[PDB]
Design an enzyme around this catalytic site. Structure first.
Site, PDB file in Angstrom:
ATOM      1  N   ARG A 110      55.078  -6.710   4.857  1.00 42.62           N
ATOM      2  CA  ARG A 110      55.666  -6.621   6.206  1.00 42.62           C
ATOM      3  C   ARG A 110      57.197  -6.645   6.274  1.00 42.62           C
ATOM      4  O   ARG A 110      57.765  -6.436   7.360  1.00 42.62           O
ATOM      5  CB  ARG A 110      55.075  -7.711   7.115  1.00 42.62           C
ATOM      6  CG  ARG A 110      53.606  -7.479   7.464  1.00 42.62           C
ATOM      7  CD  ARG A 110      53.046  -8.630   8.337  1.00 42.62           C
ATOM      8  NE  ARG A 110      52.607  -9.742   7.494  1.00 42.62           N
ATOM      9  CZ  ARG A 110      52.399 -10.971   7.919  1.00 42.62           C
ATOM     10  NH1 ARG A 110      52.596 -11.268   9.209  1.00 42.62           N
ATOM     11  NH2 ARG A 110      51.984 -11.903   7.048  1.00 42.62           N
ATOM     12  N   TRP A 128      52.392   2.058   0.722  1.00 47.31           N
ATOM     13  CA  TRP A 128      52.360   2.328  -0.719  1.00 47.31           C
ATOM     14  C   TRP A 128      51.738   1.140  -1.405  1.00 47.31           C
ATOM     15  O   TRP A 128      51.654   0.065  -0.828  1.00 47.31           O
ATOM     16  CB  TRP A 128      53.750   2.620  -1.302  1.00 47.31           C
ATOM     17  CG  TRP A 128      54.749   1.564  -1.062  1.00 47.31           C
ATOM     18  CD1 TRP A 128      54.881   0.375  -1.742  1.00 47.31           C
ATOM     19  CD2 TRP A 128      55.773   1.587  -0.080  1.00 47.31           C
ATOM     20  NE1 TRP A 128      55.938  -0.338  -1.230  1.00 47.31           N
ATOM     21  CE2 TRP A 128      56.502   0.379  -0.205  1.00 47.31           C
ATOM     22  CE3 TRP A 128      56.163   2.524   0.901  1.00 47.31           C
ATOM     23  CZ2 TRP A 128      57.603   0.078   0.614  1.00 47.31           C
ATOM     24  CZ3 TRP A 128      57.253   2.229   1.712  1.00 47.31           C
ATOM     25  CH2 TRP A 128      57.966   1.019   1.563  1.00 47.31           C
ATOM     26  N   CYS A 184      48.954  -9.095   5.451  1.00 51.17           N
ATOM     27  CA  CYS A 184      49.764  -8.048   4.796  1.00 51.17           C
ATOM     28  C   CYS A 184      51.047  -8.581   4.140  1.00 51.17           C
ATOM     29  O   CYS A 184      51.987  -9.090   4.813  1.00 51.17           O
ATOM     30  CB  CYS A 184      50.066  -6.856   5.754  1.00 51.17           C
ATOM     31  SG  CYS A 184      51.315  -5.654   5.088  1.00 51.17           S
ATOM     32  N   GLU A 211      46.330  -4.083  -6.556  1.00 52.09           N
ATOM     33  CA  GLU A 211      45.238  -3.479  -5.769  1.00 52.09           C
ATOM     34  C   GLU A 211      44.420  -2.481  -6.604  1.00 52.09           C
ATOM     35  O   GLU A 211      43.192  -2.482  -6.559  1.00 52.09           O
ATOM     36  CB  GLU A 211      45.773  -2.770  -4.529  1.00 52.09           C
ATOM     37  CG  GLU A 211      46.479  -3.658  -3.533  1.00 52.09           C
ATOM     38  CD  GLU A 211      47.010  -2.857  -2.352  1.00 52.09           C
ATOM     39  OE1 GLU A 211      46.168  -2.534  -1.479  1.00 52.09           O
ATOM     40  OE2 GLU A 211      48.240  -2.544  -2.308  1.00 52.09           O
TER      41      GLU A 211
HETATM   42  C1  HEM Z   1      54.623  -0.324   2.822  1.00 52.61           C
HETATM   43  C2  HEM Z   1      53.946  -0.931   1.853  1.00 52.61           C
HETATM   44  C3  HEM Z   1      52.747  -1.871   2.073  1.00 52.61           C
HETATM   45  C4  HEM Z   1      52.326  -2.762   1.159  1.00 52.61           C
HETATM   46  C5  HEM Z   1      52.904  -3.026  -0.263  1.00 52.61           C
HETATM   47  C6  HEM Z   1      51.183  -3.455   1.704  1.00 52.61           C
HETATM   48  C7  HEM Z   1      50.431  -4.403   1.057  1.00 52.61           C
HETATM   49  C8  HEM Z   1      49.216  -4.901   1.489  1.00 52.61           C
HETATM   50  C9  HEM Z   1      48.265  -5.663   0.698  1.00 52.61           C
HETATM   51  C10 HEM Z   1      48.402  -6.015  -0.803  1.00 52.61           C
HETATM   52  C11 HEM Z   1      47.244  -5.996   1.493  1.00 52.61           C
HETATM   53  C12 HEM Z   1      45.999  -6.799   1.107  1.00 52.61           C
HETATM   54  C13 HEM Z   1      44.788  -5.976   1.494  1.00 52.61           C
HETATM   55  C14 HEM Z   1      43.958  -5.670   0.281  1.00 52.61           C
HETATM   56  O1  HEM Z   1      44.221  -6.282  -0.804  1.00 52.61           O
HETATM   57  O2  HEM Z   1      43.028  -4.830   0.455  1.00 52.61           O
HETATM   58  C15 HEM Z   1      47.504  -5.485   2.809  1.00 52.61           C
HETATM   59  C16 HEM Z   1      46.676  -5.631   3.903  1.00 52.61           C
HETATM   60  C17 HEM Z   1      46.919  -5.140   5.170  1.00 52.61           C
HETATM   61  N1  HEM Z   1      47.988  -4.349   5.549  1.00 52.61           N
HETATM   62 FE1  HEM Z   1      49.693  -3.931   4.410  1.00 52.61          FE
HETATM   63  N2  HEM Z   1      50.951  -2.961   2.986  1.00 52.61           N
HETATM   64  C18 HEM Z   1      51.884  -1.973   3.240  1.00 52.61           C
HETATM   65  C19 HEM Z   1      51.898  -1.242   4.407  1.00 52.61           C
HETATM   66  C20 HEM Z   1      51.129  -1.490   5.553  1.00 52.61           C
HETATM   67  C21 HEM Z   1      51.218  -0.751   6.809  1.00 52.61           C
HETATM   68  C22 HEM Z   1      52.108   0.499   7.039  1.00 52.61           C
HETATM   69  C23 HEM Z   1      50.345  -1.315   7.677  1.00 52.61           C
HETATM   70  C24 HEM Z   1      50.053  -0.927   9.136  1.00 52.61           C
HETATM   71  C25 HEM Z   1      50.975  -0.229   9.827  1.00 52.61           C
HETATM   72  C26 HEM Z   1      49.690  -2.419   7.013  1.00 52.61           C
HETATM   73  C27 HEM Z   1      48.785  -3.269   7.598  1.00 52.61           C
HETATM   74  C28 HEM Z   1      47.885  -4.050   6.901  1.00 52.61           C
HETATM   75  C29 HEM Z   1      46.697  -4.631   7.459  1.00 52.61           C
HETATM   76  C30 HEM Z   1      46.185  -4.546   8.930  1.00 52.61           C
HETATM   77  C31 HEM Z   1      46.054  -5.363   6.290  1.00 52.61           C
HETATM   78  C32 HEM Z   1      44.722  -6.162   6.249  1.00 52.61           C
HETATM   79  C33 HEM Z   1      43.694  -5.118   5.781  1.00 52.61           C
HETATM   80  C34 HEM Z   1      42.240  -5.507   5.916  1.00 52.61           C
HETATM   81  O3  HEM Z   1      41.913  -6.410   6.738  1.00 52.61           O
HETATM   82  O4  HEM Z   1      41.416  -4.887   5.172  1.00 52.61           O
HETATM   83  N3  HEM Z   1      50.175  -2.482   5.726  1.00 52.61           N
HETATM   84  N4  HEM Z   1      48.710  -4.826   2.775  1.00 52.61           N
HETATM   85  C1  LIG Z   2      34.840  -6.691   4.969  1.00 50.84           C
HETATM   86  C2  LIG Z   2      36.294  -6.255   4.993  1.00 50.84           C
HETATM   87  C3  LIG Z   2      37.164  -6.779   5.955  1.00 50.84           C
HETATM   88  C4  LIG Z   2      38.508  -6.372   5.975  1.00 50.84           C
HETATM   89  N1  LIG Z   2      39.337  -6.892   6.923  1.00 50.84           N
HETATM   90  N2  LIG Z   2      38.965  -5.463   5.054  1.00 50.84           N
HETATM   91  C5  LIG Z   2      38.134  -4.946   4.092  1.00 50.84           C
HETATM   92  C6  LIG Z   2      38.655  -3.951   3.059  1.00 50.84           C
HETATM   93  C7  LIG Z   2      38.826  -4.640   1.693  1.00 50.84           C
HETATM   94  C8  LIG Z   2      39.778  -5.850   1.796  1.00 50.84           C
HETATM   95  N3  LIG Z   2      40.638  -5.741   0.632  1.00 50.84           N
HETATM   96  C9  LIG Z   2      40.125  -4.778  -0.326  1.00 50.84           C
HETATM   97  C10 LIG Z   2      39.450  -3.772   0.603  1.00 50.84           C
HETATM   98  N4  LIG Z   2      40.547  -2.959   1.136  1.00 50.84           N
HETATM   99  C11 LIG Z   2      41.065  -1.907   0.289  1.00 50.84           C
HETATM  100  C12 LIG Z   2      42.553  -1.542   0.367  1.00 50.84           C
HETATM  101  N5  LIG Z   2      43.366  -1.993   1.479  1.00 50.84           N
HETATM  102  C13 LIG Z   2      44.710  -1.464   1.454  1.00 50.84           C
HETATM  103  C14 LIG Z   2      45.733  -2.320   2.177  1.00 50.84           C
HETATM  104  C15 LIG Z   2      47.030  -1.530   2.193  1.00 50.84           C
HETATM  105  C16 LIG Z   2      47.905  -1.550   1.097  1.00 50.84           C
HETATM  106  C17 LIG Z   2      49.093  -0.821   1.123  1.00 50.84           C
HETATM  107  C18 LIG Z   2      49.381  -0.046   2.246  1.00 50.84           C
HETATM  108  C19 LIG Z   2      48.498  -0.023   3.337  1.00 50.84           C
HETATM  109  F1  LIG Z   2      48.762   0.728   4.437  1.00 50.84           F
HETATM  110  C20 LIG Z   2      47.326  -0.771   3.306  1.00 50.84           C
HETATM  111  C21 LIG Z   2      36.775  -5.331   4.060  1.00 50.84           C
END
Ligand code: HEM
Ligand SMILES: Cc1cc(N)nc(C[C@@H]2CNC[C@@H]2NCCNCCc2cccc(F)c2)c1
Ligand code: HEM
Ligand SMILES: Cc1cc(N)nc(C[C@@H]2CNC[C@@H]2NCCNCCc2cccc(F)c2)c1
Ligand SMILES: C[C@H](O)[C@H](O)[C@H]1CNc2nc(N)[nH]c(=O)c2N1
Ligand SMILES: C[C@H](O)[C@H](O)[C@H]1CNc2nc(N)[nH]c(=O)c2N1
Ligand SMILES: [Zn+2]
Lengths: 411, 407
Positions: B109, B278, B106, B283
Site C-alpha cells: 500500500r 506487481w 495488502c 507469492e
Molecule cells: C503494486 C504492488 C502490490 C503488491 C506488491 C501487493 C502485495 C500484496 C500481497 C503480498 C498480498 C497478499 C495476498 C496474497 O498473498 O494472496 C496482497 C493482498 C491484497 N492486495 Fe495488494 N499488492 C499490490 C497492489 C495492489 C493493488 C493495486 C490493489 C488494489 C487496487 C491491491 C489490493 C489488495 C487486496 C484487496 C488484497 C487482499 C486479497 C485477498 O483477500 O485475496 N493490491 N497484496
Molecule cells: C478464500 C480466499 C479469500 C480471500 N480473501 N482471498 C483468497 C485468494 C488467496 C489468498 N492468497 C492467495 C490467494 N490469492 C492469490 C494472489 N493474490 C494476489 C494479491 C496481489 C498481489 C500483487 C498485486 C495485486 F494487485 C494483488 C481466497
C-alpha cells in the site's frame, strides 16, 4: 453456538464448542482485532465461583461429578474461603490444574505432550534458599543428561499480594548481556537490564559472550537473593555445522533446557506467581529468534560473510540463505550431543494431530496462529494453512510484569 | 479509544485513532479471536452515501462548504427518486484509491495513491468487458515496467444484473485431473478449468496453459475469450548458479491481477473490478510453487540439489525453498519485469505504516497476511504490532459465481 475452522490445504473442517466454556476477554472487539498485540488481592465474592468452576471441571474429569466426594470438597472449600478468605489445593487438584494450564496455553505448539508433565509441589517453601534448592532439583530432573523431561515447580500462592514468591529471571537459564560504552553489546542484548540488576545485587560478572546468569529469587515478598546454579547442572551444546567446518569458529553455544520462569499460573482462582516450567526446544527458537533477531545475537551478517554470499542486494536472499544454515547447525549440534530438540516441521505436524484429537475428545483447542506458525518457512509447515480460534480457558498461564517494576524494596 | 502498537525490535510506539472511524465488523468478539479465519434499500443507502461524501469533501478541504452540501442534496434526491445514485469521476477515483489504502491484508500500500483507474461503467456486454480487460492488461504490463491499475464495471442494481469476472485472477494456469489420479498444471484451478471445457474451451492440455476469461455481463450467462498471448507476459524461471534449474520447465506470468473481489464505495457495489499491481517474489516461489495443494515442486528441487531427504531435520525443504525464491527474483529481474522481494516490500510497508500513523492516525493491517510465508521473523513486519479493522471504501471477497448463477 458452533464455530467451524478449515484447513485450506486438506479441506478438513472442524467444529468448536469448547469456546462456549470461555469467560475471560481476548482484547478483541467486534470492531478491532488485537491478535498481533503481544499484551492485549481477590475477594471472597469473586473467589468461590472461581473455585467451584474449577472443582466441577476436576470432578468431571475423574468422572465423579455430583459424587459425595465432589460435594464434600465444595463444602470444605466454601468453609475455608469463609474462614480464611482463601483455600489450599489438594495435590491431585494441583497436578490436574498445572497440566490443564499447559493444555489451555494457546501460544504453545508443544501441547501434544501436555499430559506428560512432572509436577513438583514446592508449596512448603519459605525462603529463597529453599527456592534455589527446589530449582536445582527441577533443572537436574528436567535435563536428565540430555534426555529432556517436561516439568514444573510450583511455589506458594499469592496471599495479600504483599508476600509474593517470584523468580526474577525470565528463564532459569539465560546468558548475560553487557552494554558497552561504544553502544555495542557483549552477550545477549535481551538480558542487559536483568544483568545490570544482578550486578548491582552483588554478582561478579565474568563479562563474556555466554555467561550463565545467576538466579534471583524472592520468597514471601522479601527482597530477592542471588544464587549461582551449579555449572555441572547446566547442559550446554557447542554449535557446529555438518558441512561447514568454519562454523565452530564463530564460538557459538546454547543451553539445552528452556525453562520459563516469569509466568503466573492461575488455578481455581488461586495465583501461583512463581511456577517455573520447562520442556525442550524447537530449533527455530534458538536458530531463528535467539541468533538472528536484530535485537539479539544478530549473527546473520557474520555467517553470510563466511559463506561468501552476495550481500549487496536483499534480493540475493542472503539473509534467508544464512538463516537456514544456522538452523541446520542448531539441529545437527543438539542431535549429535543427544540433547532433545524438535525441528519446526515435526513439531507443527504433531501439533496438527494434537489439535484434531482435541476437537474430537474436548470439542476444541484454543490456538494463537501468530505464535504457532514458526518464524521461518511459515507456509511449508501445516499450521500455516490451519484456521485456528483463540480464546482464553482456565486454568491458565499468564504473563506478569517484571518484578523490579513492582517490588517494594525493604532494604 | 486511543490504542498503542509497539514494534518489539525498534521499540517505536504508535497511537491509533483511525480505528474509531471503523464501521464494519471484524469477526472477533471479546471472548473469541478469529484473526486466522480466511472468511470471518433507500433507507440503508443514504447514510452510506453521506458517510462517503463527508470523507471525500473533507479530503479536498471543502467539508461543510456549499459544493459539499449541494452534492449531498443531489445524491439524496437521486436516491429518493432512482433508489441508487452515480459517482462523479472524481469520487470514483478517490474511492478506488481508498479501497486499496484500506486493504488491511495488502503489504504493497505504500503505492496506494498511484493507481490508474479505468472507468468502464459505460460497458454493456461481455465482448465489451473483454475489450476493457485486454486494454487493462496491456496498460498495466507496460512491457515489464508494471503499473498499478483497476478497471471498474457497472455497479449492482437489483442484484440479478451483476457484472462478474468468473476467473479469480485475469491470468492463471489450467489444472486437469489425470487418468492416473494426479494433477497436471495448477490444481487450484481444476474446477474452473472443467467449467471452461463445459462452456466449450478447447484445452491445450499442458502444464502452463493460460486460462480463458469467463465474463458475465449484466446478469447474463458468461462467455469465453482467450487473451491475446502477446498481451500475456511470461518469465522463464532460471537460477543464477544452478545450470539444471531451467530444465524443470518452469515459468510464471508477470501480472498479478485479482478479478474476483467486490469494490464498495459509498454503499455502491462494484462486483466486477479487476485490479493489478506487481508481484512480491514469495507469492510465486513460496505459495504457487511450493504449497502442497499447488505445483508442489519442493520434492523435485531438493532432489536436483542432492540434499539429504531422509529426515525433516536436515531442513532440505527449507534449503530448496530459498534457492527457488532466489530463482524467481533472478528471472524477473534479468527480464526487466517489475518484482519486489519480501525484505524490500516489508521494509516499505513499515515506512508506509509510519507515514499513515502520522498523517492519518493509523493503518489497518492484518499481521497474519502481511508477514511473508517464509523467513517471517527476519522481516521487520514480524516484530510490528498491527491493529486490524475494517474501513470503507473497501475490497471484499465474494463467493465464486458458479454457485450463485443459474444458466
Ligand atoms: C503494486 C504492488 C502490490 C503488491 C506488491 C501487493 C502485495 C500484496 C500481497 C503480498 C498480498 C497478499 C495476498 C496474497 O498473498 O494472496 C496482497 C493482498 C491484497 N492486495 Fe495488494 N499488492 C499490490 C497492489 C495492489 C493493488 C493495486 C490493489 C488494489 C487496487 C491491491 C489490493 C489488495 C487486496 C484487496 C488484497 C487482499 C486479497 C485477498 O483477500 O485475496 N493490491 N497484496
Ligand atoms: C478464500 C480466499 C479469500 C480471500 N480473501 N482471498 C483468497 C485468494 C488467496 C489468498 N492468497 C492467495 C490467494 N490469492 C492469490 C494472489 N493474490 C494476489 C494479491 C496481489 C498481489 C500483487 C498485486 C495485486 F494487485 C494483488 C481466497
Ligand atoms: C515439551 C516441549 C515444548 C515445546 C517444544 C514447546 C514449544 C513452544 C514454543 C515454540 C512456544 C512459543 C514460545 C516462544 O516462541 O517464545 C511455546 C510457548 C509457550 N509454552 Fe510451550 N513448549 C513445550 C513445553 C511447554 C511446557 C512444559 C509448558 C508449561 C507446562 C509450556 C507452556 C507454554 C506457555 C505458557 C507458552 C507462551 C509463552 C509466553 O507467553 O511467553 N510449554 N511453547
Ligand atoms: C512481552 C512478552 C509476552 C509474553 N507472553 N512472552 C514473552 C516472552 C517472549 C515470547 N517469545 C520470545 C520470548 N520467549 C522466550 C522463551 N519462550 C520459550 C517457550 C518454551 C519452549 C519450550 C519449552 C518450554 F517450556 C517453553 C514476552
Ligand atoms: C508483534 C508480534 O505479535 C510479535 O512479534 C510476536 C509474533 N509471533 C511470535 N511468535 C512466537 N512464537 N514468539 C514470539 O515472540 C512472537 N512474537
Ligand atoms: C489459515 C490462514 O489464515 C491462511 O492459511 C492464511 C495465512 N496467511 C496468509 N497470508 C497471505 N498473504 N495469503 C494467504 O493466502 C494466507 N493464508
Ligand atoms: Zn481478533
Amino acid at each position: 453456538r458452533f464455530l467451524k475452522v478449515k484447513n485450506w490445504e486438506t479441506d478438513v473442517v472442524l467444529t468448536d464448542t469448547l469456546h462456549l466454556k470461555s469467560t475471560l476477554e481476548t482484547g478483541c472487539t467486534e470492531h478491532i482485532c488485537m491478535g498481533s498485540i503481544m499484551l492485549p488481592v481477590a475477594t471472597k465474592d469473586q473467589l468461590f465461583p472461581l473455585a467451584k468452576e474449577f472443582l466441577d471441571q476436576y470432578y468431571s474429569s475423574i468422572k465423579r461429578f455430583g459424587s459425595k466426594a465432589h460435594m464434600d470438597r465444595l463444602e470444605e472449600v466454601n468453609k475455608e474461603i469463609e474462614s480464611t478468605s482463601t483455600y489450599q489445593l489438594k495435590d491431585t487438584e494441583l497436578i490436574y490444574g498445572a497440566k490443564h494450564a499447559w493444555r489451555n496455553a494457546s501460544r504453545c505448539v508443544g501441547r501434544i505432550q501436555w499430559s506428560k508433565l512432572q509436577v513438583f509441589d514446592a508449596r512448603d517453601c519459605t525462603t529463597a534458599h529453599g527456592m534455589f534448592n527446589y530449582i536445582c532439583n527441577h533443572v537436574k530432573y528436567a535435563t536428565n543428561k540430555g534426555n529432556l523431561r517436561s516439568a514444573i515447580t510450583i511455589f506458594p500462592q499469592r496471599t495479600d499480594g504483599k508476600h509474593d514468591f517470584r523468580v526474577w529471571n525470565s528463564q532459569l537459564i539465560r546468558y548475560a548481556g553487557y552494554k558497552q560504552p561504544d553502544g555495542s553489546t557483549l552477550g545477549d542484548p535481551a538480558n542487559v537490564q536483568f544483568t545490570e540488576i544482578c550486578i548491582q545485587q552483588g554478582w561478579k560478572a565474568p563479562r563474556g559472550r555466554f555467561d550463565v546468569l545467576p538466579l534471583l529469587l524472592q520468597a514471601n515478598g522479601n527482597d530477592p537473593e542471588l544464587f549461582q546454579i551449579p555449572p555441572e547442572l547446566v547442559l550446554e551444546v557447542p554449535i557446529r555445522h555438518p558441512k561447514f567446518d568454519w562454523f565452530k569458529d564463530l564460538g557459538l553455544k546454547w543451553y539445552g533446557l528452556p525453562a520459563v520462569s516469569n509466568m503466573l499460573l492461575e488455578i481455581g482462582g488461586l495465583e501461583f506467581s512463581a511456577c517455573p516450567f520447562s520442556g525442550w526446544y524447537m530449533g527455530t527458537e534458538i536458530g531463528v529468534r535467539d541468533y538472528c533477531d536484530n535485537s539479539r545475537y544478530n549473527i546473520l551478517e557474520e555467517v553470510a560473510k563466511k559463506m561468501d554470499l552476495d550481500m549487496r542486494k536483499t534480493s540475493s536472499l542472503w539473509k534467508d540463505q544464512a538463516l537456514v544454515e544456522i538452523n541446520i547447525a542448531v539441529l545437527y549440534s543438539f542431535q549429535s550431543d543427544k540433547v532433545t530438540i524438535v525441528d519446526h516441521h515435526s513439531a507443527t505436524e504433531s501439533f496438527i494431530k494434537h489439535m484434531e484429537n482435541e476437537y474430537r475428545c474436548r470439542g476444541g483447542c484454543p490456538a494463537d496462529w501468530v505464535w504457532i506458525v514458526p518464524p521461518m518457512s511459515g507456509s511449508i509447515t501445516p499450521v500455516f494453512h490451519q484456521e485456528m480460534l483463540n480464546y482464553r480457558l482456565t486454568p491458565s498461564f499468564e504473563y506478569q510484569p517484571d518484578p523490579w517494576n513492582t517490588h517494594v524494596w525493604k532494604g
